[PDB]
Amino acid sequence: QMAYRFNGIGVTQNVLYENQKLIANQFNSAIGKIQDSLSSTPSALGKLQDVVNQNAQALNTLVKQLSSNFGAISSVLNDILSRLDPPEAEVQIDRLITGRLQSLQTYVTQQLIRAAEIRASANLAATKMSECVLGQSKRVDFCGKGYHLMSFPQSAPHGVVFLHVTYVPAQEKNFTTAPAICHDGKAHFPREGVFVSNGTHWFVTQRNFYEPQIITTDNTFVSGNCDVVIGIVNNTVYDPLQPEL
Amino acid sequence: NKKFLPFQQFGRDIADTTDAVRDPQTLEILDITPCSFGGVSVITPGTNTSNQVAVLYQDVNCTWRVYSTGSNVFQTRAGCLIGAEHVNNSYECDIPIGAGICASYQTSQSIIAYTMSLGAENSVAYSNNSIAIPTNFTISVTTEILPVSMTKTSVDCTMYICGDSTECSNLLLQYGSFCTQLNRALTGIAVEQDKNTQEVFAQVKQIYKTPPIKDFGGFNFSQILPDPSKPSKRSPIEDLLFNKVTLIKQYGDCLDLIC
Amino acid sequence: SVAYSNNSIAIPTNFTISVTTEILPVSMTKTSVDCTMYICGDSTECSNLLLQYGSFCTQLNRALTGIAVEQDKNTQEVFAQVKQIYKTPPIKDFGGFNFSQILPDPSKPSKRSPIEDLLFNKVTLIKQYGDCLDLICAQKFNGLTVLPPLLTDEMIAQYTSALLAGTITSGWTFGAGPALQIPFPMQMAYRFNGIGVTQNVLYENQKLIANQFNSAIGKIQDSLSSTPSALGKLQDVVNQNAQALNTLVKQLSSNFGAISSVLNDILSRLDPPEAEVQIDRLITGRLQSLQTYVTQQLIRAAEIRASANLAATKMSECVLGQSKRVDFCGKGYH
Ligand SMILES: *[C@@H]1O[C@H](CO)[C@@H](O[C@@H]2O[C@H](CO)[C@@H](O)[C@H](O)[C@H]2NC(C)=O)[C@H](O)[C@H]1NC(C)=O
Ligand SMILES: *[C@@H]1O[C@H](CO)[C@@H](O[C@@H]2O[C@H](CO)[C@@H](O)[C@H](O)[C@H]2NC(C)=O)[C@H](O)[C@H]1NC(C)=O
Ligand SMILES: *[C@@H]1O[C@H](CO)[C@@H](O[C@@H]2O[C@H](CO)[C@@H](O)[C@H](O)[C@H]2NC(C)=O)[C@H](O)[C@H]1NC(C)=O
Ligand SMILES: *[C@@H]1O[C@H](CO)[C@@H](O[C@@H]2O[C@H](CO)[C@@H](O)[C@H](O)[C@H]2NC(C)=O)[C@H](O)[C@H]1NC(C)=O
Ligand SMILES: *[C@@H]1O[C@H](CO)[C@@H](O[C@@H]2O[C@H](CO)[C@@H](O)[C@H](O)[C@H]2NC(C)=O)[C@H](O)[C@H]1NC(C)=O
Ligand SMILES: *[C@@H]1O[C@H](CO)[C@@H](O)[C@H](O)[C@H]1NC(C)=O
Numbered sequence: 071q072m073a074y075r076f077n078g079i080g081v082t083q084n085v086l087y088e089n090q091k092l093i094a095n096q097f098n099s100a101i102g103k104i105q106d107s108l109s110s111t112p113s114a115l116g117k118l119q120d121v122v123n124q125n126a127q128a129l130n131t132l133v134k135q136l137s138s139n140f141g142a143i144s145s146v147l148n149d150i151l152s153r154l155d156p157p158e159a160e161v162q163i164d165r166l167i168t169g170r171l172q173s174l175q176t177y178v179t180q181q182l183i184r185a186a187e188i189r190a191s192a193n194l195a196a197t198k199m200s201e202c203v204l205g206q207s208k209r210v211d212f213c214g215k216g217y218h219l220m221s222f223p224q225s226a227p228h229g230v231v232f233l234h235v236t237y238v239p240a241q242e243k244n245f246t247t248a249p250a251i252c253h254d255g256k257a258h259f260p261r262e263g264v265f266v267s268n269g270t271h272w273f274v275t276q277r278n279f280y281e282p283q284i285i286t287t288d289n290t291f292v293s294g295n296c297d298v299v300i301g302i303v304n305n306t307v308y309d310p311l312q313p314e315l
Numbered sequence: 316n317k318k319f320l321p322f323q324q325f326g327r328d329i330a331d332t333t334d335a336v337r338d339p340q341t342l343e344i345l346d347i348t349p350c351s352f353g354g355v356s357v358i359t360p361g362t363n364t365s366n367q368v369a370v371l372y373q374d375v376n377c378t379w380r381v382y383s384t385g386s387n388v389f390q391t392r393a394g395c396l397i398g399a400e401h402v403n404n405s406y407e408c409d410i411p412i413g414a415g416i417c418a419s420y421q422t423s424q425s426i427i428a429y430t431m432s433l434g435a436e437n438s439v440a441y442s443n444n445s446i447a448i449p450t451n452f453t454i455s456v457t458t459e460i461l462p463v464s465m466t467k468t469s470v471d472c473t474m475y476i477c478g479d480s481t482e483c484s485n486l487l488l489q490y491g492s493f494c495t496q497l498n499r500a501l502t503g504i505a506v507e508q509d510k511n512t513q514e515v516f517a518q519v520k521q522i523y524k525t526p527p528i529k530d531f532g533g534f535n536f537s538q539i540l541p542d543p544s545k546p547s548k549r550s551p552i553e554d555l556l557f558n559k560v561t562l563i564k565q566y567g568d569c570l571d572l573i574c
Numbered sequence: 575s576v577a578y579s580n581n582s583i584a585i586p587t588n589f590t591i592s593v594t595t596e597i598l599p600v601s602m603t604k605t606s607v608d609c610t611m612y613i614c615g616d617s618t619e620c621s622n623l624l625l626q627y628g629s630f631c632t633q634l635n636r637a638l639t640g641i642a643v644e645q646d647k648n649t650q651e652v653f654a655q656v657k658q659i660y661k662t663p664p665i666k667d668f669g670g671f672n673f674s675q676i677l678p679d680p681s682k683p684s685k686r687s688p689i690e691d692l693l694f695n696k697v698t699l700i701k702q703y704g705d706c707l708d709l710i711c712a713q714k715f716n717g718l719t720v721l722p723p724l725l726t727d728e729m730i731a732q733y734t735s736a737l738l739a740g741t742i743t744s745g746w747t748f749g750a751g752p753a754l755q756i757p758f759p760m761q762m763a764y765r766f767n768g769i770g771v772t773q774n775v776l777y778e779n780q781k782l783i784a785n786q787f788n789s790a791i792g793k794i795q796d797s798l799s800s801t802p803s804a805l806g807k808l809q810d811v812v813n814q815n816a817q818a819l820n821t822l823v824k825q826l827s828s829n830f831g832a833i834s835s836v837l838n839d840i841l842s843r844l845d846p847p848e849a850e851v852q853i854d855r856l857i858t859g860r861l862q863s864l865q866t867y868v869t870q871q872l873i874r875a876a877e878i879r880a881s882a883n884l885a886a887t888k889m890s891e892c893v894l895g896q897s898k899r900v901d902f903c904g905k906g907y908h
């Protein structure tokens with residue numbers, strides 16, 4: 071399966087099969103580092119804590135707004151009712167009713183805006199569950215930084231944590247490159263890969279991993295002559311048909 | 316410079332506030348201007364960490380309308396900063412002040428103000444016949460945390476506005492379907508939270524089980540697979556995530572912010 | 575009418591390299607409101623009467639502070655994708671491709687591209703007490719202030735320049751790891767392979783493709799310099815914010831059922847008992863105006879946040895990579 075996912079990012083599967091223990095060890099060490107980094111950093115889950123903090127703060131503000139007068143003589147209904155007849159108590163309780171109705175309407179409006187934001191975040195989380203966990207994504211930075219291999223979901227309080235396993239290239243080397251190879255008056259182009267050279271010798275390799283190979287007629291295809299391509303390089307293209315001929 | 320017509324005494328602004336007047340003894344036109352102007356912000360590294368603060372005065376040019384001057388003053392495009400030293404190095408942003416200026420608390424400890432650094436400089440060795448190809452790789456696992464739902468709340472309007480008062484309830488009846496509207500909105504939010512959770516998590520309809528022998532070619536999923544020993548069948552990572560987030564209350568247990 | 579037949583196909587014998595613009599809003603202006611100066615400006619009796627309403631203005635300031643922090647978060651999420659400031663080489667031999675209209679101009683005092691200079695000239699956006707003793711002055715005298723963005727336009731230009739240098743020197747490799755250099759004709763041959771065309775098509779038509787690219791960039795510059803309504807969305811955002819602030823200023827002239835709109839005219843004709851009713855009416859009306867402004871700002875900030883999330887996604891998938899999604903990064907094969 072992970073050889074298939076290596077094929078999905080442009081690396082041949084023999085790279086995985088010849089490095090299976092190393093890839094497994096790197097995956098295990100990365101999962102253990104994820105466990106340690108989540109156990110150490112206190113502000114790692116601040117996105118989920120902010121939702122709980124905002125909801126609790128909104129409810130406590132709604133409770134605390136019952137102490138306001140809103141232009142009336144008091145904030146307690148029972149103190150108004152025990153000092154006034156039904157007409158002036160009607161006036162003061164009308165002021166309190168208008169103020170508390172305004173407080174409730176403000177709370178409901180802010181909750182609607184916050185719920186729209188939470189719904190957008192949940193639609194994004196459902197899209198990431200569909201495209202990162204249930205498949206392999208070619209979208210850049212949608213499922214982590216690097217070439218995405220696979221993702222794993224974890225439940226969290228009011229949320230989801232995605233563990234994105236990605237492939238990162240490392241230990242680059244610079245080589246001399248050419249667009250085409252001129253062998254017999256014909257221009258040769260790589261079928262998949264890139265011509266590279268160590269100054270003296272020319273090979274064709276895959277683009278995301280250094281694996282040099284002898285430039286043959288099976289590695290390359292022919293298009294035109296050596297007069298159109300700018301930067302074409304003279305080299306020999308080996309023919310496998312006539313050592314055995 | 317206003318020229319009043321002879322029947323006029325006061326001049327008004329676009330907000331209908333009196334901003335011009337005619338002096339009744341010497342007939343000259345005066346412009347009235349408010350005294351208070353300019354916003355003020357305060358910068359602290361935490362009251363637990365220290366007691367010194369820095370004060371940012373917006374709309375103040377120090378090349379004054381300040382509370383107290385100090386030993387170090389600094390003129391940013393966000394205003395005049397008093398109480399912070401200006402250094403010439405560039406770091407990452409600790410406390411954002413504005414206009415490319417950030418502040419931090421460095422060691423004798425004091426608040427330093429600096430221009431933020433966008434990152435380390437890099438120059439790719441571009442040539443017209445040179446390529447760079449990786450010879451190795453790293454397998455990297457990164458976390459992404461996404462909110463899905465929030466708490467579903469319901470409000471009894473009569474108990475909030477007119478709690479255990481009959482006269483207030485009979486007065487609240489003369490406002491109409493406002494509280495029915497509020498409860499309808501909150502019910503829609505509460506239904507939407509369950510819809511959000513169902514859309515994120517209930518993608519598959521079969522409950523798949525891992526095999527009892529965990530031979531996966533060397534790959535170890537023990538930190539993300541469920542732990543059968545725990546009373547809650549969660550992964551170790553999931554148990555850590557549930558411990559790291561802090562979220563029936565009877566009448567007899569109440570008679571507390573939730574109460 | 576497509577000439578459909580059961581054994582007929584249409585195959586293109588040529589191509590066009592097309593450059594199109596997409597304009598996306600990212601942030602809006604960060605505003606702060608002093609409640610006491612807006613409702614009860616330089617009046618002690620009004621401030622004492624406003625103290626009986628509670629934490630309403632704390633709620634309003636919390637909402638506006640959240641909006642102001644979210645604007646800087648929007649700009650950081652769109653532009654600060656890479657953390658290395660890549661530079662272009664001093665020799666600009668890119669196989670015939672000419673990025674001079676999008677690369678920074680070192681002669682200008684602001685290191686901006688010619689296209690970026692045109693875009694900044696085509697969108698029209700410290701005010702001391704001494705030089706105010708103007709709509710901004712009237713806004714600032716009623717407690718309404720505009721906070722500066724955390725990143726200046728020079729820093730955004732630096733981030734854009736770093737993204738451009740990384741793209742034209744390394745292709746999509748710098749967005750997924752270390753920047754691996756590659757010649758630009760070979761990079762666009764890779765991108766031709768990404769849309770299903772063999773690379774010899776590019777290598778045998780390199781001068782024509784480079785000329786089409788250069789002419790399309792020059793046409794983009796001319797069409798942005800000619801059409802005045804090209805940057806309509808950013809100007810609409812600026813106009814909406816300015817109109818909201820001016821409406822908030824102009825709403826101070828309303829009576830709200832009281833005998834006047836001036837605080838001092840009420841206070842100079844009435845004793846504090848009969849003044850207090852009118853001051854309470856003005857307080858309720860101006861509180862309603864502030865709440866309406868904050869609610870509209872919250873809805874507008876949600877829309878701007880959606881636009882900024884889309885712009886960050888387009889920066890990730892169109893600039894840092896080659897997209898197979900149809901019409902996400904222009905019309906045609908991206
Ligand atoms: C570029 O590739 C060639 C071909 O592999 C390298 O030549 C080989 O060098 C080793 C050195 O130990 C010899 O043992 C081989 O016999 C050589 N192969 C031949 C002659 O076909 C060459 O060294 C490489 N360039 C560099 C700079 O390492
Ligand atoms: C690549 O190889 C070709 C073929 O051997 C070279 O072309 C010849 O170059 C010589 C010297 O200039 C001429 O006298 C011949 O007439 C050319 N033949 C053809 C068929 O064009 C070419 O010069 C080589 N290129 C490099 C850079 O060495
Ligand atoms: C590719 O990278 C891996 C990871 O760093 C290298 O594996 C390490 O190799 C060193 C030296 O042999 C050992 O000391 C480490 O223990 C290895 N790490 C792991 C996780 O196995 C590997 O050698 C590199 N391969 C090449 C060709 O450079
Ligand atoms: C493919 O299209 C290009 C662009 O239209 C053609 O290039 C033009 O060719 C005409 C006639 O040779 C010239 O007058 C123009 O100056 C060329 N334009 C450019 C930008 O170079 C090209 O000829 C077409 N090729 C085919 C095979 O139809
Ligand atoms: C890239 O295109 C620009 C024009 O868009 C070229 O700049 C022109 O250069 C010529 C000669 O150097 C001047 O006469 C023009 O005034 C320049 N125009 C502008 C708008 O600057 C530039 O030379 C091109 N780059 C290369 C490498 O040829
Ligand atoms: C690279 O540039 C050099 C110097 O201008 C030139 O001689 C060479 O032909 C160029 N190669 C390619 C492939 O453009």
Ligand SMILES: *[C@@H]1O[C@H](CO)[C@@H](O)[C@H](O)[C@H]1NC(C)=O
Pocket residue numbers: 376377378391392700
């Ligand atoms: C502050 O005043 C000085 C004196 O002219 C001026 O040079 C400087 O630009 C001003 N600062 C700002 C941010 O306007």
Ligand SMILES: *[C@@H]1O[C@H](CO)[C@@H](O)[C@H](O)[C@H]1NC(C)=O
Pocket residue numbers: 102529535536537
């Ligand atoms: C997986 O890792 C844990 C701790 O890292 C270890 O205890 C366990 O034995 C490992 N699983 C296997 C099959 O080795």
